[PDB]
Amino acid sequence: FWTQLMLLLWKNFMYRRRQPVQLLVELLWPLFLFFILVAVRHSHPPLEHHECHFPNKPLPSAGTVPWLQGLICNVNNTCFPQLTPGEEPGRLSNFNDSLVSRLLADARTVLGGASAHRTLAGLGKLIATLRAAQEPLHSLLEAAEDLAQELLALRSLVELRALLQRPRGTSGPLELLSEALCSPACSELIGALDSHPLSRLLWRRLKPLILGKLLFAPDTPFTRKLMAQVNRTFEELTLLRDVREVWEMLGPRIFTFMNDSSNVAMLQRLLQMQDEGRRGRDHMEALRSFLDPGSGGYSWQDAHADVGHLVGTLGRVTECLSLDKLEAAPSEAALVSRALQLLAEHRFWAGVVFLGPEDSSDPTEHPTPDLGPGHVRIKIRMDIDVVTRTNKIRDRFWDPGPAADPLTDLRYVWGGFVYLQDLVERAAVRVLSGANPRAGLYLQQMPYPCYVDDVFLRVLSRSLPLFLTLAWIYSVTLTVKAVVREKETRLRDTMRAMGLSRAVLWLGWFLSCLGPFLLSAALLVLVLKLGDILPYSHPGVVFLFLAAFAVATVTQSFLLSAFFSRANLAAACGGLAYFSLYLPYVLCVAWRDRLPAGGRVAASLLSPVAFGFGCESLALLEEQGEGAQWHNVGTRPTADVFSLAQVSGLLLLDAALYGLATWYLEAVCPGQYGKVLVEEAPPGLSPGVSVRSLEKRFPGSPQPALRGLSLDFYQGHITAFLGHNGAGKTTTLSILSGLFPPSGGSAFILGHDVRSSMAAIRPHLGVCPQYNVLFDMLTVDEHVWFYGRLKGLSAAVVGPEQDRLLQDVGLVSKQSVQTRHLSGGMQRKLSVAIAFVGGSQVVILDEPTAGVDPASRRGIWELLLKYREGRTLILSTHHLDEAELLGDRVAVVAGGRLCCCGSPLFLRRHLGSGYYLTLVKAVGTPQLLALVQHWVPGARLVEELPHELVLVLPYTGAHDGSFATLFRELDTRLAELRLTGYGISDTSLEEIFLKVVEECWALTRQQLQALLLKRFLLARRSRRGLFAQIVLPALFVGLALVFSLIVPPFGHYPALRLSPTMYGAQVSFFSEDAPGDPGRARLLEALLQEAGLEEPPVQHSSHRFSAPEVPAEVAKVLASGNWTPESPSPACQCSRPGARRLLPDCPAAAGGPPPPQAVTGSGEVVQNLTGRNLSDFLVKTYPRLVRQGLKTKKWVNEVRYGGFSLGGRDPGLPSGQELGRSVEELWALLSPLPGGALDRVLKNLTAWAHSLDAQDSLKIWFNNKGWHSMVAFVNRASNAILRAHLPPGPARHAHSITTLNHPLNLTKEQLSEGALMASSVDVLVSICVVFAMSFVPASFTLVLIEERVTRAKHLQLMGGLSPTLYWLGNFLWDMCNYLVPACIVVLIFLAFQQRAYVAPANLPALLLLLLLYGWSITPLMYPASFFFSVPSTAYVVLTCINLFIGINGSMATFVLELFSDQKLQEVSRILKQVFLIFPHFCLGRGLIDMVRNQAMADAFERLGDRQFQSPLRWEVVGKNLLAMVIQGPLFLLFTLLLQHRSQEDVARERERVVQGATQGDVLVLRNLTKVYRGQRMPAVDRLCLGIPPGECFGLLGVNGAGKTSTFRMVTGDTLASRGEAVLAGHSVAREPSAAHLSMGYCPQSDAIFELLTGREHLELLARLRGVPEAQVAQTAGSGLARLGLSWYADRPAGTYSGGNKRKLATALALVGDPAVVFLDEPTTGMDPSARRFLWNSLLAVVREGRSVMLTSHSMEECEALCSRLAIMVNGRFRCLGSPQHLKGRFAAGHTLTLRVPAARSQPAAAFVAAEFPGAELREAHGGRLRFQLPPGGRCALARVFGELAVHGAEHGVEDFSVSQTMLEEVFLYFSKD
Ligand SMILES: *[C@@H]1O[C@H](CO)[C@@H](O[C@@H]2O[C@H](CO)[C@@H](O[C@@H]3O[C@H](CO)[C@@H](O)[C@H](O)[C@@H]3O)[C@H](O)[C@H]2NC(C)=O)[C@H](O)[C@H]1NC(C)=O
Ligand SMILES: *[C@@H]1O[C@H](CO)[C@@H](O[C@@H]2O[C@H](CO)[C@@H](O[C@@H]3O[C@H](CO)[C@@H](O)[C@H](O)[C@@H]3O)[C@H](O)[C@H]2NC(C)=O)[C@H](O)[C@H]1NC(C)=O
């Protein structure tokens, strides 16, 4: 068992080693791909980011100073690793380092304690004034001293002063403002801003807010009140001008009172020193503070100058205030127009629409929520370049980031949308409520944990199977091609029938093909591990996975190899079939979430899908910081993924299923590869081979293939078997061997049945089929070694058998060369010798001389002479002339039944015609007849043709005395008879064999009409093929049109409603601080009610919230540590050095116990989170929520989006109440101005001081991944505030605010973008119609190629067919074939009503484009027919090249034209649109331009278009059409020029031809010379021949003689280098058409069409030869009648027998009556009845008066059919004469055979040598003798004849036979030597 196993393994290894190029490329193919992958990975290393925190952001509702402070400081959004002060529950602002806050606090704390001083001063002044109609001075002095001392202890004043006295260097004003915080003057400010890029970008972001223009469409007084309430903040802001002008008016007055009022001031100051002196050092320090004698110090002048400078700076800052940025518009359309006009000068900011519920103008929305007032709806319109897009909510590809980038994602902040929303909401709540609520809103972004960003892992998981499949496609194709090639040549059948079993072959193939896959897998695992692609993973698991996949793919390849039956077809189709199974993985991964878990296992049946699922599981497990390892082989990383063990099990199950399916399907072909006149009494009775009434019945044929055969064979005799094809000979051979079991009868061989003995009869059996059994890569030595080893011979003595056989076959010199496919013809003798290696007693041969050269034929025959002893041999060969030489006994079968059998002596050849007496001439028939009758009455006259006379001598009464007297008289008369020659031949076995077989301008118009009919019939006969190759390509795109519009077309962004409920179920916060206030409780209750919670009764409300239970281990961990509700969580690990993780993972004890929660009616979850950080909790608990959606990473649904914290008051001491008291005391008492110039200012200062309480605040935590969370939560907060402030009642339910979002429709550049720069559906349609239409043009070359490889085209050309007409007809038929799919696709476009292809202006463009596309694309495929030799591979290559060039050119030019950045891309595409040439690229450009222009017309016709945009314009599609139509005929011209690129008797006949030419002689040859290139010797050199037309000429020769060269030169196949060959007086060189018009050519090649029938060919030829239409039918009838064809009339010519092909070729040649008919090898292995019809037809045609020249190997026919023969060797004639003279001249002597029952040589040889002087002998055997009498005997043969008549009495002789020098005497001479 093992022996054949490793023999097969060694044979496969020998195959593999002999093709180094394939092995090297197979090894090196995936290495480059994985090197590319490794380089790609090396390009982008992973990134790491630490834990991140963000600062707070205020809003204008909170205040003015904090809002601007935030706007200025938090421009940059720097991430903070530590905690920020704003997130703690207590603090709100984080700007104590800010100078402004310190200044405000200092001012408040100083003015708080100064009330007593100012009040005392005021009351003193008033009492002094009242008494007008010293102690107050002292009190005022002390108060001023105290205030001066207090203001001295204020550093912030010192820093601000030091800031003021500085030059104007550095950068500009805003940098100084930022340092202090964190109109030509305006023109200079803008210039300074543009001076520095930082200030440049700051001003770019800030300017639209400053210089905007707010608008509102409705103009009712309600909206006017709303707008006034809106800009109340702007009204308050523009107050600095009032104080500026107040200072500007007051300063001059006090200044005038300051200087030149010096005497008076000195007077009071001198008065006030002695006031304190006589009542200390504190006073003069106060005096120095006043600086009354101020020269060294600086108080007054500098204070005045600095106050003026600061006021001027503030005025300059406020100079460019917008002042009035609020306008109104009457209508929405007018609003849009005015907004666009403002956008023209960069003035527009945002438009507001107060859409009312009563208006009912709501697209896709309810007109109103309910009847009655109290509902307000607001739209905000802004430029699309600012507001975020409004088409999708969540990102389509999850990223592991916090999404904090102010330029890209944070658009609502620097666009000002939130500011306007907050202002409008505050105005609306103020107007609706009727009160003045206060709530400072703050925005806080939730923190994000430390993470690692790596884009490579997801694409790796999505792309690894693709790389593996493209890596192993080559190996799959090679394996399937090798298997199919082996199974095609039936060698597997020989191995199975010769002793092997199916299991051994399958295991050998498996273990042969499992090597390279495992080697590649090992190399890939090594490069993956060492390439850092999959780090931290143990290689063993990956290697096992890859090995399982390799096993699955190799068994899948074996399964795939069970469909095809052609080598190259299988090689081409296997790769496509295997790659086509990978798409379902892509389809599944696209719809990953949709598919249920039930279908996953079902889809995993295909190997690539299972591998992809395993790969994604491996990648997901890799991302968790630990690759594949033994720790977690059987653990599922996620709830809905597969562990690797399940994947491996599924792979092995699939492999087993595929193997079993292949084993079952191997039986799809059962078996198919897709009269008693006898004698049994030999002298040696050795029944070695015997069959007794065998029976078998094939399923296809109801009649049994072979009937009962009771004949038995005998050892020691070379028995011969004769029969017809399909007459049971093949069935008998199959049954005798092990191919099929014996169905009936007995087949006992050597006493044991073949079926009973099984393998025990193999050691002594010999089978040699007609098909060769050889291996191309091996050589003869290992061939015989392998065969001897497999047959069971011991390897010890295999060497002697090997060398003995190789020396016996005479291949000693040719075995050391070690070449198999480098030799031809010789291999037959080696193949037949292989059957003799085992020394089997019984050997079977089937056609051992099928096509071998005669010069070696005797060779193999000699081998049979070497093994004619001690062995039984049974040969079954169709021919007869070889059978007689080796025939000890002969058996005959006919119709699956034995007819006769016996021995070739008279016991079998019972024929009346005994001997044939031939008389030749160089006189008179009556005289010869009278002489013959006188000598012997017995004589028959059968032949009387001129120059010969054949008589028949009856066998009965063969009295040799009378014949001897007759021939002696002839010897005494032949001298004067002028005959000078005669002969007596015996009965040829052919005639007796047959007898016993039946004993038991209009011309070319009709030519092209015929060609069109032929093409139409050929196309129509393949019904399924034509439908498949026409209907399918059109309907593919036809049905793909409707399904290609998945991608939505671009359009206006829809109006979106903003609300938290639009996301779904989620988790929110309502954390609260300082609950000691009824208003805060009311606000919290309003928030709870708005969240969707119902107020329960108090008894149930007591337990309205429930705390989830804590696990025991978590509680134990918390208790073990020291954890408080505020204290930090236990811990949480991070990314270790090297061991990176996507997200931190730490135990559930982190974050504390689960907080109490409740569930609302809408599925929302609310959580009560007071008493914590509320920050560390979020950081710890974030990844747990997201981990669920991490499996697919496509549309991740987070739970936490936002939350509220009710921060109340602010820890600090502003004490603004006493500030208001001081301000009102100053206003009422000091300087009461009735005009209000100061009174209104003091009023607003009092209002600000009293409003400084800031009763409460509210912080909103938002998650930025949700795109519209910010505005939704702001709206919810505003609605909750209004609900809280509203009184209880029904109106609470009926009052609400709705905020929407609706960007302005479009501008021009957005049109340019969204009209064509997407074009996804249009591009897909264009490329799809590019691919689908490309298959048709390559389909036409199949027919041309298959006619070119066959000699059918050549046979057609030897008619009257000109190449021009042929090519034109092919082109026209291709037009007719192509016309249908174009109509189908155009009707499809009409059916789907595509807008771009339905208008009256664009339809002709498409029609002409498609039609002319086909017209100009068909001729390009024609030139490819010549080079290629295989149809399917040529079709595949042409289709691939067409698709490649088309898609590459089109997509390259497309991607170049869009996304243009630099002028270099502009020029190149222009050239890429000028080079043209390719019709594929032309069609692509035309269609894509059509669709682009239609799209731009559709976009522009919505607006004012004013452009015709004609599709038919010259510069649009016209140039392509013109260029391609004018180049169309160029391909036809080039291909036609490529096709037409080609531009002693021997001596006496030579002299006769040289001296002149005969007019009657049709064939005249002069200087016949053919010189071969590179062979150093011409094939034929200087011959000549003159063939008369009234007789039939025959030419003969050995291989290499050059006869085929002569035939091809006469035909015209070979270029006529030199020589004259003229037929019928018409020269081939002068006019080849005239020579070929009347030539009837019949080659050995079966140039036939499978679909076409014989009668179709005959009718086609007849109508090509000018036969009238009516006479064509009768000509076809006569042509079939002269060959029969009654049973084959309707059958196609392809499905005929072997001889029927040649007979129909002869019929085709003879039809039309050509001047000369040439036949090359017309009789090669057919039934003798076909030969009978053939010689009948040829005698008829030669009698008709036409010349026929025939050349073949069997010349006996020519002896029996023609009257002139010529032998030629190596281009030199040898005989060239009349056939009888040829035998008389060179064939020389005569031979004699004797058959003696005693089988003793001497008694016969004595008088045989006595009769003639010669003593030549050959093959001296008892069965048959051969004696060569002296050649050229002058006397008659009668000298023996009568003598023989006596010697029958001397010795017992069975019979004597004489061979009187026939034509095959040359073959006898060759056999002898
Ligand atoms: C809320 O939880 C946070 C922790 O999530 C508490 O703040 C943390 O306080 C510790 C104690 O100082 C900080 O540890 C420090 O780490 C630095 C790192 O270099 C180290 O140099 C110091 O010696 C110290 O060990 C920790 O950084 C800090 N957390 C953050 C994010 O900065 C906070 O106290 C909790 N709130 C409470 C208790 O009210
Ligand atoms: C931006 O898009 C809006 C919305 O499509 C455009 O408003 C639309 O303008 C057209 C005028 O070109 C209006 O068509 C009119 O319809 C009435 C019937 O309601 C008909 O009687 C008129 O004869 C005219 O056909 C259309 O109603 C109006 N609205 C919609 C929803 O289509 C707007 O014009 C676009 N921007 C610009 C600058 O055009």
Ligand SMILES: *[C@@H]1O[C@H](CO)[C@@H](O[C@@H]2O[C@H](CO)[C@@H](O)[C@H](O)[C@H]2NC(C)=O)[C@H](O)[C@H]1NC(C)=O
């Ligand atoms: C707020 O809006 C109102 C009306 O829309 C403005 O009232 C007028 O504003 C212009 C220029 O701003 C003044 O010239 C008029 O005298 C104002 N008339 C009245 C009756 O007030 C108001 O000015 C706007 N507020 C601001 C700061 O511009």
Ligand SMILES: *[C@@H]1O[C@H](CO)[C@@H](O[C@@H]2O[C@H](CO)[C@@H](O)[C@H](O)[C@H]2NC(C)=O)[C@H](O)[C@H]1NC(C)=O
């Ligand atoms: C606050 O200052 C304003 C001046 O800017 C005082 O006068 C008001 O001015 C606006 C327009 O600027 C008018 O529409 C109002 O009618 C004016 N009077 C009032 C009472 O608002 C305003 O009086 C000052 N505030 C207080 C409380 O006196």
Ligand SMILES: *[C@@H]1O[C@H](CO)[C@@H](O)[C@H](O)[C@H]1NC(C)=O
């Ligand atoms: C903004 O922050 C980035 C990143 O830290 C820094 O490089 C840049 O200088 C900052 N720019 C400004 C204007 O603050």
Ligand SMILES: *[C@@H]1O[C@H](CO)[C@@H](O)[C@H](O)[C@H]1NC(C)=O
């Ligand atoms: C004030 O008056 C004095 C008187 O000599 C004069 O010199 C001075 O220029 C005036 N202005 C100021 C600002 O001192």
